[PDB]
């Protein structure tokens, strides 16, 4: 395609295919500097892949889910963000709401998963 | 000669044609409870693996010979026949744990 | 994908016993069974018996059981997938109607149902 | 719900409930002391996932398996567990079969993808 | 069965069962040398959990795909390979399609995701 955030400046519509490219390039004063960065790399990672595991998303580079879209996040269409939007813009907008989401996702993956043990029971 | 495992006896063919040889024997040694094997052998020489376990080939065996096997006899099939086929065909009945008990042999002509 | 030199045409008298070699090279030798296999005037090709160069263990017809010594050696490594060995076969009551061509086999696989299925061959020894 | 483990004294049942709360606060002098628990905390955290892994839970929080319940290990009924044993309780009375039934879980996973890699076969 | 690399001269079809035991054994002078290692060790081992992530495979021992085998990798059979040769003497066949299978599983995942999202739409 395009390389490493080729499609950071096109629409999310476009950059949202083929997205394991910015998923592989993820992970004495030189070496203690080095080593430092080196650690915070796997750190960094593995919180995302943390977060992914507590939505069910573990694996997944695209994910739907339960949480339905709250309005009051964005009051835009599909076609006007999908096809306008580019995935800076849109995140900024979001940005206030990311942390409410987050926690919506969680609760909809452990009330998954417990119903989910119930449905096995029989 | 006290092969219990009985062939063709012998068949002809003809440039770009296809051959078919049998092999069958009693229920002590066909088939249904036993792979074939088929090997072609010049005269007393190297012989040569063509097709193991009914109608598996060998590495490198050319995609003519084939293989069958019914209930009661195995089938060893020669498609298009070219020129350098003449010699003689042997099966054989195994299973994982035995040996080869040999055919009684099936000389093939070419000639054309 | 080897070599499997035997000896000469050695040709003794019956009641005799006569020693036939089978040097191996250009593969692992443990990994293959080694049969035995003749083609006498007076029958077709007979199978004799295989042996394992890694299980020592041997497996022969019960019309060859109380006539043949079979043995190996052990192999000396070349490479990482690459030896040298060498399997030996003698007779017990040798007659005439032994007379024949004898050649060495290697095994076909390592595992499944066609393991020692005689693939490939030696070079033939003509007995007495 | 509590909050980190909150639920710690309560029974098996209770606890069970919304365990996201301890999955997400899982993950010179001072540098080196700092750096030390940094690795150390990464090697522990991944140690449980690679466990979760060979068994199938990758991702799982309530995780159901095929090997059944030894007996031999603890011969009380599921409500004298879950409505009365707390967490902390209940492991020390399985604390030694613990590591028998980590060797159970692998094999019941590694002769499931097993079982389901001749499944696709046809 | 054997243990640690227990099957390396074995056939392919003995060494893949239970695989589960080279999987759990993959993860100042002294000091700075052991903390070294210990970091290169998580990264290596996160390196084929990254891999396995963007195949579909995270979680997985044995995991079929889509893409199909070009003979242009290797001619030979299914039992002329699983019942002869050993996993080591594979590989060094493969060696060099290697990093072109690696490809083909990628895109192979992005574009079952992609079909799994419009699955998803009705
Ligand atoms: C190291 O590498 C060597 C060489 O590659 C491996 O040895 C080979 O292993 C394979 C599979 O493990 C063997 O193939 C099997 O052969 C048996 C035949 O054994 C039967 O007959 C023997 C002679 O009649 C007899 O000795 C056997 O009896 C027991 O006693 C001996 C004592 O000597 C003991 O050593 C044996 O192990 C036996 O337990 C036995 O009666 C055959 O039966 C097998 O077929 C069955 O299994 C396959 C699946 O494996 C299945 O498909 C079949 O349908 C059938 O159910 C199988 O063909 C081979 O013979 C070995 N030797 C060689 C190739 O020379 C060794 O395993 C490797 N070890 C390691 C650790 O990697
Ligand atoms: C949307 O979010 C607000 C809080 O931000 C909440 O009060 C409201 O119930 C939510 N509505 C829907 C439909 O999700
Ligand atoms: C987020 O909150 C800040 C509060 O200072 C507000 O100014 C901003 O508009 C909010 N974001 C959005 C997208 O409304
Ligand atoms: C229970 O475990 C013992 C060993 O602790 C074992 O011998 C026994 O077969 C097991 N029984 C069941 C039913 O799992
Ligand atoms: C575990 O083993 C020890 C051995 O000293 C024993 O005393 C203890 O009772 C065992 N645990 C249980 C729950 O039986
Ligand atoms: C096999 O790979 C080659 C390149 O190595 C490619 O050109 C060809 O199309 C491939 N064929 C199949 C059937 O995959
Ligand atoms: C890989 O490429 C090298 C190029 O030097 C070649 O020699 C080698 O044969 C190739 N590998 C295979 C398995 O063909």
């Known amino acids: 395609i395009l390389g490493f955030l080729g499609a950071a400046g096109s629409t999310m519509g476009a950059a949202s295919m083929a997205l394991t490219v910015q998923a592989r390039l993820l992970l004495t004063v030189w070496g203690i500097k080095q080593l430092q960065a080196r650690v915070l790399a796997v750190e960094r990672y593995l919180r995302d892949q943390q977060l992914l595991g507590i939505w069910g998303c573990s694996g997944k580079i695209i994910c739907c889910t339960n949480v339905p879209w709250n309005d009051s996040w964005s009051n835009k269409t599909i076609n006007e963000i999908w096809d306008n939007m580019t995935w800076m813009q849109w995140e900024k907008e979001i940005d206030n709401y990311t942390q409410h989401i987050y926690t919506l996702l969680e609760v909809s993956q452990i009330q998954q998963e417990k119903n989910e043990q119930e449905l096995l029971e029989l | 000669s006290q092969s219990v495992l009985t062939q063709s006896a012998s068949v002809s063919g003809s440039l770009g044609q296809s051959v078919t040889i049998s092999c069958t024997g009693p229920n002590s040694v066909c088939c249904s409870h036993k792979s074939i094997s088929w090997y072609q052998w010049p005269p007393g020489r190297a012989p040569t693996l063509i097709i193991y376990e009914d109608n598996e080939r060998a590495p490198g065996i050319s995609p003519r010979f084939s293989g069958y096997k019914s209930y009661w006899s195995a089938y060893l099939t020669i498609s298009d026949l070219r020129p350098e086929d003449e010699t003689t065909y042997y099966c054989c009945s195994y299973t994982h744990n035995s040996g080869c008990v040999f055919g009684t042999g099936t000389k093939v002509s070419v000639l054309g | 994908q080897g070599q499997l030199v035997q000896s000469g045409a050695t040709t003794t008298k019956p009641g005799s016993s006569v020693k036939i070699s089978c040097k191996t090279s250009?593969?692992?030798?443990?990994?293959?069974?080694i049969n035995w296999i003749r083609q006498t005037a007076g029958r077709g090709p007979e199978w004799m018996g295989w042996?394992?160069?890694?299980?020592?263990?041997?497996?022969?017809?019960?019309?060859?059981?109380?006539r043949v010594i079979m043995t190996t050696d052990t192999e000396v490594p070349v490479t990482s997938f690459t030896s040298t060995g060498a399997a030996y076969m003698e007779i017990r009551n040798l007659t005439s109607d032994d007379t024949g061509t004898y050649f060495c086999?290697?095994?076909?696989?390592?595992?499944?149902?066609?393991?020692?299925?005689?693939?490939?061959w030696g070079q033939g020894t003509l007995l007495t | 719900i509590l909050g980190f483990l909150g639920a710690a004294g309560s029974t098996m049942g209770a606890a069970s409930m919304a365990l996201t709360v301890q999955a997400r606060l899982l993950l010179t002098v001072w540098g080196i002391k700092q750096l030390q628990a940094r690795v150390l905390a990464v090697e522990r955290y991944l140690r449980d996932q690679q466990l979760l892994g060979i068994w199938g839970c990758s991702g799982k929080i309530i995780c159901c398996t095929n090997v059944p319940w030894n007996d031999s290990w603890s011969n009380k009924t599921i409500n004298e567990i879950w409505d009365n044993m707390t967490w902390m309780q209940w492991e020390k009375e399985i604390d030694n079969y613990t590591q028998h039934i980590y060797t159970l879980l692998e094999v019941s996973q590694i002769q499931q993808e097993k079982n389901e890699q001749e499944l696709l076969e046809l | 069965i054997l243990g640690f690399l227990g099957a390396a001269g074995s056939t392919m079809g003995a060494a893949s069962m239970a695989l589960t035991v080279q999987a759990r054994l993959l993860l100042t002078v002294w000091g700075i040398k052991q903390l070294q290692a210990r970091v290169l060790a998580v990264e290596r081992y996160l390196r084929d959990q990254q891999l396995l992530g963007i195949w579909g495979c995270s979680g997985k021992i044995i995991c079929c795909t889509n893409v199909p085998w070009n003979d242009s990798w290797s001619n030979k059979t299914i039992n002329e390979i699983w019942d002869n040769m050993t996993w080591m003497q594979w590989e060094k066949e493969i060696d060099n399609y290697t990093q072109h299978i690696y490809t083909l599983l990628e895109v192979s995942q992005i574009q079952q995701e992609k079909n799994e999202q419009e699955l998803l739409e009705l």
């Open positions: 042996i394992s160069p890694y299980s020592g263990d041997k497996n022969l017809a019960p019309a060859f059981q109380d």
């Open positions: 250009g593969y692992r030798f443990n990994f293959y069974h």
């Open positions: 086999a290697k095994g076909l696989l390592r595992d499944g149902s066609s393991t020692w299925l005689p693939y490939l």
